[PDB]
Amino acid sequence: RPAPLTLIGLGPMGQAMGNALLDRGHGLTVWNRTASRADALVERGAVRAPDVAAAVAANELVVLSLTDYDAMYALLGPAADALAGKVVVNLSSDTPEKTRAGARWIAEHGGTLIAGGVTCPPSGIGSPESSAFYSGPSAAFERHRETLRTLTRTDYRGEDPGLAALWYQIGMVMWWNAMLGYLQAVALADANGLKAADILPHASDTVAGLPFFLRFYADRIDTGHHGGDADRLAMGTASVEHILHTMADSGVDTALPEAVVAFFRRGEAAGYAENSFSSMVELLKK
């Protein structure tokens, strides 16, 4: 049942990915720019391909966990011709356009690229609650969907490889902003005698109440309802200025809070003070 596969890219994610596959009983062949990284997996039952050309040729499925799509060209460029009949599932982050450019390159060499965006940390590889967006030619994705179901759940977003990257970037823009806000909160807390452990209960309660506002503002934004019934930008403009000045009074970097105040200053200049802060989506759109 568990089909063989080549995994190139053995960082935090691909290492855990190879673990989850060998665990299920898959035929793992691992290659990496840093060949030292392919050693614990190789000791657990994986074959070190001596070259990327041999890696690409060992199996039909080539899974990629690299920092970006440029890393793919740099690793598979030496073996470009060996990509014929091969299916490259790139679980690497990049722009939809750069994701499609990768697909085109694999396509010039007789292979098909399936894009992928894992929405889980390395600890989540092998966990059923973990999911990944996938996009690109259906047949190639479908004939490997079950080996990919070993890593995460499969959410097909379309035939355009760019869609999986677009959906990953949609969730990551919220993830990174919230996590930079955590780092900002931890820094304000350290400047005030507190630890991340002291502010963790509140932080978690704060981010878990977020889905309410996500729903509250979804339909309202999709209809142009930016009424000040639950909030006025003017009140929130004061709120973000309070974060900036509280941070400044406590000696904490003000670059990120000053950039947030600037966005609210643009909303005030657009006449949105009596409207919901949601109105500022019209400054981000188009």
Ligand X SMILES: NC(=O)C1=CN([C@@H]2O[C@H](COP(=O)(O)OP(=O)(O)OC[C@H]3O[C@@H](n4cnc5c(N)ncnc54)[C@H](OP(=O)(O)O)[C@@H]3O)[C@@H](O)[C@H]2O)C=CC1
Ligand Y SMILES: NC(=O)c1ccc[n+]([C@@H]2O[C@H](COP(=O)([O-])OP(=O)(O)OC[C@H]3O[C@@H](n4cnc5c(N)ncnc54)[C@H](OP(=O)(O)O)[C@@H]3O)[C@@H](O)[C@H]2O)c1
Ligand Z SMILES: Fc1ccc(F)c(C2=NCCC2)c1
Cα–Cα distance for residue pair 124/113, rounded to 1 Å: 24
CB of 30 to ligand Z, least distance (A): 21
Three-state SS for 150? Answer: coil
What are the φ and ψ backbone dihedral angles of 106, each rounded to 5 degrees?
Answer: -60, -40
Question: Does residue number 231 form part of the binding site for ligand Z (CB under 6 A)?
Answer: yes
- Count of other CB atoms within 10 angstroms of residue 281: 15
Which of ligand Y, ligand Z, ligand X, none does residue 209 bind to, with CB < 5 to 8 Å depending on kind? Answer: ligand Z
Name the residue nearer to ligand Y (CB basis): 6 or 93.
Answer: 93
Question: Does residue number 209 form part of the binding site for ligand Z (CB under 6 A)?
Answer: yes
Which of ligand X, ligand Y, ligand Z, none does residue 56 bind to, with CB < 5 to 8 Å depending on kind? Answer: none
- Binding residue for ligand X, selected from 7, 49, 57, 75, defined by CB under 6 A: 75
Least Cα distance to 74 among 114, 39, 17, 34 occurs for 34
Helix, strand, coil: what percent of the chain each, to 5? 55, 15, 30
Which of ligand X, ligand Z, a copy of itself, none does residue 75 bind to, with CB < 5 to 8 Å depending on kind? Answer: ligand X
Question: Does residue number 43 form part of the binding site for a copy of itself (CB under 8 A)?
Answer: no
Least Cα distance to 19 among 112, 99, 122 occurs for 122
Torsion sign (Cα): 206, 207, 209, 212: positive
The pattern of x and - marking residues 151 through 190 that bind ligand X according to CB under 6 A reads ----------------------------------------
CB of 12 to ligand Y, least distance (A): 4
Can you read off the two tokens belonging to residue 266? 């643009």
- Binding residue for a copy of itself, selected from 34, 36, 43, 129, defined by CB under 8 A: 129
CB of 13 to a copy of itself, least distance (A): 9
Question: Does residue number 235 form part of the binding site for ligand X (CB under 6 A)?
Answer: yes
What are the φ and ψ backbone dihedral angles of 59, each rounded to 5 degrees?
Answer: -135, 175
- Helix/strand/coil (H/E/C) assignment for every residue in 66-130: CCCHHHHHHHHHHHHHHHCCCEEEECCCCCHHHHHHHHHHHHHCCCEEEEEEECCCHHHCCCCCC
Region binding ligand X by CB under 6 A among candidate stretches 61-69, 134-142, 146-154, 263-271: 61-69
Chain centroid offset of residue 116 CA: 9
Which residues are at the interface with ligand X (CB under 6 A)?
9-14, 32-34, 37, 65-67, 71, 74-75, 91-93, 118, 121-122, 230-232, 235, 239
Which residues are at the interface with ligand Z (CB under 6 A)?
119-121, 175, 209, 230-231, 236, 239, 277
